[PDB]
Amino acid sequence: TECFFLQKRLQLSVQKPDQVIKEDVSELRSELQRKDALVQKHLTKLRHWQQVLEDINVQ
């Protein structure tokens, strides 16, 4: 079944690369969204830790 799916993939790529281009664009968009979300989470955690250090360094 896997080989049948891969043969279908070959025939589709040689018959219609626009679908492959659209899929690549969608994957790139999803990767960009995931990277932005991870960066936002890291920034939130870093700001929380910065406030924690500023409140704890009162000595």
Binding site: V39, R47, L53, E54, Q59
Partner: protein, 105 residues
């Protein structure tokens, strides 16, 4: 700790005893009530101040030979200074990373 407050109270009591002796002498020499009791209280307070001064002077005399209690925990002071410096450097690096992230987004 308590010896400092004791000496301060002894000095305040000596001052109060001097003031009470002066006031009692004034009231007794003004004209001729409570002058006798005032003079008695003044003499008693003066004797108490003298006894407290003598007791404080007759202290255990801890060292009287050299500089005592040498070493004021300088190692702990330096350790705390280094910890504060570490915290400051961590804060600076975190602020730099936050600025980089803000420039990214």
């Amino acid at each position: 700790n308590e010896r400092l407050r004791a000496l301060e109270d002894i000095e305040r009591e000596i001052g109060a005893i001097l003031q009470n002796a002066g006031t009692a002498i004034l009231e007794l020499s003004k004209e001729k009530r409570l002058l006798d009791r005032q003079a008695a209280a003044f003499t008693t307070s003066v004797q108490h101040v003298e006894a407290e001064l003598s007791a404080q002077i007759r202290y255990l005399t801890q060292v009287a030979t050299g500089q005592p209690h040498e070493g004021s925990s300088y190692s702990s002071r330096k350790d705390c200074q280094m910890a504060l410096k570490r915290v400051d450097y961590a804060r600076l690096k975190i602020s730099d990373v936050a600025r980089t992230c803000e420039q990214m987004l």
